[PDB]
């Protein structure tokens, strides 16, 4: 019910962010660290505990509907913890046939091919328990060996096998600069598959994400583990409309259907205000409905730089505003009329409005508060710049001729990496095209 | 109620036609009775729950169910109506309730 989702967790990051996600859903839905229900009435269908992210055993110990692929470390940490039993050791695949990704996409893509069937068995088992499948979410990092290669391989297969379902990926991007040049190889080979085979991709730009971690959390001992807590709060907020269908103007599937302008543009950027504590002092920062409303419009806390936080001269394809916490509705409408009129986003010659907002309340299983929060998820045409950069890096690397040997065995890449050349032309046609849509030529008769 | 009968009978017992006192006794009974009647409606026969439900069904704020009713029904409605559709639609209605995830726990 509500249309089920399967999460695929690839690489270190996905598995880490996935463990945190589960603790957060488990608390919120008043269930155990083994999914065991809360014994007095804590849930009498006041909420519908999300069968999309859960499956029910008949001990009624809720289990997450998730497939983990990585090697041993991340899975081990969960298994040590009392978080096991909100795990499934069958969903868990640990490489013992990986034998070093090496920070090479090809190597990852290729190990994935080799163990396609055992992997496909975990996925098919998970598919078979499904009622009616909404779609998939892929959690991963790009510029990885693992995070890159194995995720891309899976995505292209999923695309062909089930062509009637939604594929979303939550992708960590590196930066709009490089210190490591072969980032660009990993990212360009992966990118082809992500552009075509994903119908939506949510970009988290790691430079930007780092700024939030450094500035907000302010701990000098900070790492990725610490940062992953910021990705999990963000990912969980986007899911509010599925997990709570009891909001009768927010329901995820129909929302997804509308917002998407076509999968041609589908790199999305989040922004969020304010922040909840996870590694720092409590949120005691309360401010007005008007204050709340102003803050959503600023992208000054940049959690992603896909070039929508540098500048806005092209146009926004769609904007969706996620409100969490009930607060006077009448006021919410009077401010909202001012926002549509004011026209904060930039616009093309035929699109001058297409910005939406949804409002949902907090659950009371959480300690009650009268602080408001919200998330922005938006699609902008500015993304093309990241491709432009990628092309600069791509020319640079290809110019050295770094490591062509591994590529040459492969039929595709015999005359050196042909796939990357094919991609270079393909990406330029798309980037030109997105510019035409900002301009008059989008409707012409 | 029986005490109340006794009370009316009490003003009548030494009567002087004092309506304000007679009303006072009556006013106390009214307030208590409306408050007990709220417990009787709300608690016993889920009134607070019924209004919320009405809002869900009649103003159709129960979007999960509706999407489902429409998916199952669509085929049948497309075909002109007869006597038998009514049974399937009711079955689809029953299925829709299950689909909307509404269930007894208290």
From Swiss-Prot, chain A:
Pfam families: Tubulin, Tubulin_C. Transmembrane segments: none annotated. It is found in: Cytoplasm, Cytoskeleton, Microtubule organizing center, Spindle pole body. Residues 43-56 have a biased composition (Basic and acidic residues). GTP binds at residues 143-149. Residues 33-56 are annotated as: Disordered. One of its GO terms (molecular function) is microtubule nucleator activity. PROSITE patterns: TUBULIN. Keywords: Cytoplasm, Cytoskeleton, GTP-binding, Microtubule, Nucleotide-binding. Its main location: cytoplasm. GO terms for cellular component: cytoplasm; gamma-tubulin ring complex; gamma-tubulin small complex; inner plaque of spindle pole body; microtubule; nucleus; outer plaque of spindle pole body; spindle. GO terms for biological process: cytoplasmic microtubule organization; meiotic spindle organization; microtubule nucleation; microtubule nucleation by spindle pole body; mitotic cell cycle; mitotic sister chromatid segregation; mitotic spindle organization; positive regulation of cytoplasmic translation. SMART domains: Tubulin, Tubulin_C. Gene3D superfamilies: Helix hairpin bin, Tubulin/FtsZ, C-terminal domain, Tubulin/FtsZ, GTPase domain. Tubulin is the major constituent of microtubules. The gamma chain is found at microtubule organizing centers (MTOC) such as the spindle poles or the centrosome, suggesting that it is involved in the minus-end nucleation of microtubule assembly. TUB4 is an important spindle pole body component that organizes both cytoplasmic and nuclear microtubule arrays. Present with 7200 molecules/cell in log phase SD medium. Belongs to the tubulin family. Interacts with SPC72, SPC97 and SPC98. PANTHER family: TUBULIN. This is Tubulin gamma chain. It comes from Saccharomyces cerevisiae (strain ATCC 204508 / S288c) (Baker's yeast). The gene is TUB4.
Swiss-Prot record, chain B:
It is found in: Nucleus; Cytoplasm, Cytoskeleton, Microtubule organizing center, Spindle pole body. It comes from the Eukaryota. Signal peptide: none annotated. Involved in microtubule organization by the microtubule organizing center, the spindle pole body (SPB). Probably part of the microtubule attachment site at the SPB. Belongs to the TUBGCP family. Present with 56 molecules/cell in log phase SD medium. Interacts with TUB4, SPC72 and SPC97. This is Spindle pole body component SPC98. The gene is SPC98. The chain holds residues 424 to 529 of 846 of the full protein.
